[PDB]
Design a protein around this ligand. Structure first.
Ligand code: J6M
Ligand code: J6M
Ligand code: UDP
Ligand code: UDP
Ligand code: NA
Ligand code: NA
Lengths: 230, 230
């Protein structure tokens, strides 16, 4: 019928990749769009080569590369989400496509934070928002959001568990800032965005502080209940 | 009926703005889309404020700002061309929309030159081409190109005539490089592009070395003949 679009949102290492890989196996009517940045973080596609280069340069000099990184990350996401939307689930009874994060996380979590940290200047940030408004303004609109809610401490521990060398330098303070932004957007719903429909979009908040890899049935039950309301 | 899309191409100060302002007055069926960069080069729209800032920073440090400038210039153009295409000439018998330059000049003249001058690195250039392929690949396809052909010397003289302070530093050598690229693309048709239809698109080449502001009737006659063949 019509594909339901659900974004999975949450802090770094909250368990989004883990959770979408669990979901994808439970139904032939369920597909996932993994986050391009996540696939850059390891044959290589031209996007993966560009992505790996711009991530490495980001760790070296964020105030030079934030604009180039954020625009390519967002383009890459829109391309990947559109491909799944136009490629998959045509023969499905109750099709659901789970996005690992969204164009809204790109702008309101990550790019916003880089502007706030002076890694983009005002011109870079205003050009980025202009580009985003227009790049979007031409189908990916969400039917719902699933917020995987973990403490900054849980997330710092999970960065340690995941063991990517380049991330071991990420401090608690950065995770706390991103946490505050997620809480404002998806819990308090205090964040003003340029996308009117978002203030109305249903949100399912799931506490993922407890390990769920072998014990996820209650989380999935909440997902199925949430889906039946949309 | 269907709007004919004609790009006006040529080197800096060849007389494109002059020529499109002549054309627009000759027919109610004729409209023009002036080049965004040209309107940045002087109430202010957010695009003009961003544009003026990024042009000034470009003159100061092209190897920092070339990618940001080229992506915003190309977005701005696509937005302006689409607005005219969807806004204007609905009640016209023989509608023609004259583009001041194109998305192809953006990439194959200007961005290509900045890459060739090491003002973009390989990642910046590959991300730019990826973005361009995709940003276009989703209506603006040209029915024809009008090439205003002037010598580098004519163009350097016309930069002096036009008198913009920031351009008086542009050397003949830069104009010669851009001239060679226009000759390869539009005269020899040696330039390989990623847009198959372009090798087929009709091109009208007009010699504009002689001043035409009070003596343009022969040029316009060639334009009307060219239009009748499309
Ligand atoms: C694992 C996180 C990766 N990471 C980032 N990801 C994204 C991202 N953007 C998307 N649109 C999607 C998406 N999925 N991800 C944006 S930035 C990233 C983060 C740092 C970074 C941050 C902050 C500190 S800090 O707190 O120490 N501090 C702050 C104050 N000031 C500057 C000094 C440094 C260090 C280092 C760098 C390099 C990347 C690449
Ligand atoms: C009037 C030209 C404006 N100009 C430019 N326009 C565009 C443009 N892009 C579009 N997509 C559309 C569009 N309409 N225009 C791109 S760049 C521009 C040019 C110089 C510039 C160039 C070359 C030399 S050089 O030859 O002296 N040399 C070269 C070797 N090396 C680096 C050292 C310097 C100087 C200065 C700068 C700053 C802008 C802003
Ligand atoms: O219940 C969980 C959820 C996640 N993880 C681990 O926490 C790290 C981060 O998870 P993930 O990659 O899914 O986080 P994302 O950044 O995608 O949110 C990984 O090493 C996971 O294996 C875990 O041990 N138990
Ligand atoms: O036949 C002409 C064509 C142009 N110009 C002048 O040459 C300069 C550059 O023209 P234009 O702005 O049209 O060039 P573009 O950069 O748009 O090609 C301007 O000062 C024009 O008034 C001129 O004197 N005679
Ligand atoms: Na599935
Ligand atoms: Na007209």
């Amino acid at each position: 019928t019509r594909i339901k679009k659900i974004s999975i949102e949450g802090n770094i290492a909250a368990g989004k990749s883990t959770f979408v890989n669990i979901l994808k196996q439970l139904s032939e009517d369920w597909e996932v769009v993994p986050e391009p940045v996540a696939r850059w973080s390891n044959e290589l596609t031209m996007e993966q080569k560009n992505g790996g280069n711009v991530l490495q340069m980001m760790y070296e000099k964020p105030e030079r590369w934030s604009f180039t990184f954020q625009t390519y990350a967002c383009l890459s996401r829109i391309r990947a989400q559109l491909a799944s939307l136009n490629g998959k689930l045509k023969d499905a009874e109750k099709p659901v496509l789970f996005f690992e994060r969204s164009v809204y996380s790109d702008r309101y979590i990550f790019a916003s934070n880089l502007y706030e940290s002076e890694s983009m200047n005002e011109t870079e940030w205003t050009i980025y928002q202009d580009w985003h408004d227009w790049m979007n303004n031409q189908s990916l609109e969400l039917d719902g959001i699933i917020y995987l809610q973990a403490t900054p401490e849980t997330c710092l521990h999970r960065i340690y568990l995941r063991g990517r060398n380049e991330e071991q330098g990420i401090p608690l303070e950065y995770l706390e800032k991103l946490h505050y932004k997620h809480e404002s957007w998806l819990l308090h719903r205090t964040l003003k965005t340029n996308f009117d429909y978002l203030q109305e979009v249903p949100i399912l908040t799931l506490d993922v502080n407890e390990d769920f890899k072998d014990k996820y049935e209650s989380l999935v039950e909440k997902v199925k209940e949430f889906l039946s309301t949309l």
